[PDB]
Design a protein around this nucleic acid. Sequence first.
RNA 1: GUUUGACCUCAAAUCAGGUAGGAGUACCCGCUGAACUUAAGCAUAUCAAUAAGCGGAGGAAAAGAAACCAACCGGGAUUGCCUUAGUAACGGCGAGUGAAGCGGCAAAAGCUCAAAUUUGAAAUCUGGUACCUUCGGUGCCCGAGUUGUAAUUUGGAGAGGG
RNA 2: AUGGUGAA
Lengths: 108, 158, 142, 70, 15, 177
Amino acid sequence: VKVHFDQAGKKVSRRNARATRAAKIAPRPLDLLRPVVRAPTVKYNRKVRAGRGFTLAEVKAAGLTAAYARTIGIAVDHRRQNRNQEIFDANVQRLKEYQSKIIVFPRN
Amino acid sequence: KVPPTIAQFQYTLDRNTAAETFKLFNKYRPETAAEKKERLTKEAAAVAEGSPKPYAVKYGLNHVVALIENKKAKLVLIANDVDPIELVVFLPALCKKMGVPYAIVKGKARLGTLVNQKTSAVAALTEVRAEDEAALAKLVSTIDANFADKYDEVKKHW
Amino acid sequence: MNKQRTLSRGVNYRHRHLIQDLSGLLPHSRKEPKLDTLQQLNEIAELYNCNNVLFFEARKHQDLYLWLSKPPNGPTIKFYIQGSRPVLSFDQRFESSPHYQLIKELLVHNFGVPPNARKSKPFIDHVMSFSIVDDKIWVRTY
Amino acid sequence: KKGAASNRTKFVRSLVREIAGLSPYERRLIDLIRNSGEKRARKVAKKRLGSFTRAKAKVEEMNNIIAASR
Amino acid sequence: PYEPLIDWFTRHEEV
Amino acid sequence: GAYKYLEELQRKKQSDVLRFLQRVRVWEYRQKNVIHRAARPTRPDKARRLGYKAKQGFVIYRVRVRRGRSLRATAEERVGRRAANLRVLNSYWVNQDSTYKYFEVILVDPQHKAIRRDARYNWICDPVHKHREARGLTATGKKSRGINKGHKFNNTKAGRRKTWKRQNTLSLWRYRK
RNA sequence: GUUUGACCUCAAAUCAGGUAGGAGUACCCGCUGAACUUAAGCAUAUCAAUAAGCGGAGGAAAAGAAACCAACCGGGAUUGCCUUAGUAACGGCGAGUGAAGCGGCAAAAGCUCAAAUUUGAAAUCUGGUACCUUCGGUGCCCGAGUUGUAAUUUGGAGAGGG
RNA sequence: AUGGUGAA
């Protein structure tokens, strides 16, 4: 039988690891931007949730190369295609706001 | 007995024609490692203190096959004792379809001696100087009658 | 005198045993490997001089459809149905409208083994209770 | 994407067809085609192959080879 | 079983 | 490249041309020992696409097993047992016999400096890959284990033995539901 | 030419440069693998795809970037938990057996080959020797390699040119 | 039942 006695210990360890990761990842928020997307189903069609990463079309619309986008923490999807125009527009607006919000140190 | 595609070998360039081909090929020995190294060192020394493409035979199997199907190669040599026979079964038919003349020569070891390599299994020439262009053309013309016309029934002899 | 000939991926023991002895009960129908989709199946009869052909379809991972139609220009219908000479029963409902009258006429040479076929036996051994009772097309045989 | 013809590959396959001759089962199939009809040839191929579409494609290939032979 | 090969394809030289 | 021609020829394994080669090679193997080191692969095109490099350290071995567990996995295990220091990467069928079957397995020497200093293949030197054939991690082994994407392998997609404990184990949280 | 040389195959060396046996074994990756025991019964159902038996690794292992899941206005690596759900589904439909998408959370790095001729220069690498600033740096030699070492590249394409 | 021991 398995008992999750380590629940509190596991949570503490996860928090400690997350805090430690900030030591090497202090300048950036330790996470990649997740696009807003619609879950595939009939029941949950009305609901909207985050996705893995922006499509190639969205990245191109945002005005930056896919390779550069990854280095700035922008997630890119290998096979995610864009079908809904409204979702693409929302993702483009989010990317534009993000880019306007970034401060990037020079390659000293 | 062997299939019709096999036994297409064992019919190869004769001693006289093979000797002539080797003599012509011996005039285009590619620069060896030592020769290239010494030439490059001399060039660097001249540069520190302050010519057209080098014609040579083509022998790499991949390079030779790439030259074939493009009509660039003017002559091709095929080794008959290739252990993986599958590597060479299609070369004669492919050359015939492309119309590129070829001559089979006995001995992969003998073939490799002309390129300073133990074995190459293939050899071909594309570029040729004017002094040797006529000789190459004459050899190609002679090879036609020597081989293609003498073995028009090669499909037989299972 | 009377002569006639006739003909999805992945099935476990139950589906394999479902259509198990239909070939032995309908010798005029051959047993051949499955072929997924449909029009080309109509031309298979040419290779066997057959005048009737049956083709299968699979849908929803749970339903199996048995199509019946004459190859050249025959009508087609389907339903989700769950060596001795047979004898076929009938029902009065099969002669009320064309939708069943035509099926009844087709069955006579689409299901009944010809009396003079290659494997047609002389003697009968079982009876079929073919009927459309309760609007269904599933019947029990003994 | 789709399997483009890739003319180079088509030529290579055509050359390999002549280089490899015909398999003994292929030899039997062509012999029956020339003497027993495509109707029986297709059935023989299906018995010696899987789906009927593959047998039909093989029979068409044999017919094309025979036509090109003369 | 034992018949000569055919040059149906190699007959025509590539252009 | 000529490798396309070799692949096309290998497609027509049933061609009468290849039958003579098959007979000659199977006879030679029958005259030869059951297991021996091959000077060079008989199917370089097949070996190259499987990740074979002509550089030093890529040893090729020939293994013969009785016809009638997967034969390829058994042959890989046998060659690994014999060639303990070598690491089994992949194998390909080259010939068959009425009673015997022949598979060619390509091996890489982890201790060879040519592989240790090569980033493209130094990963094999990791201790986790020791006796990779014994764990069924090869192409034949992975297929034999039913490890593939999709719900068609839900019984063994992530490992039947591993998933059995997960699905047949009682889990109780601190705050019982 | 009755000699001689190129190779290819395999041996010989208490020759140099190298690795494996075993132990441990809770967990991991595979093979073989039963019975007491149960519904009223043992071939499916169930102890059990278990213990024992055999082979190989690490501090975690396997798996991991789809020939995936779905049918919606679509999601877009693998893995663990809750839920989906004791549901779909299986079983003298009973006794009993027993899944998965979607949703939420933990963490999200994706990559490298075969398949196109460098051909206007095997330019690649191991080993030996001689030096240094020694988990390595360089002159020279041999060997490996042309049956392929060197520019990108795994479809989000890519390459030759302007 | 599985794994083992030695012997008129």
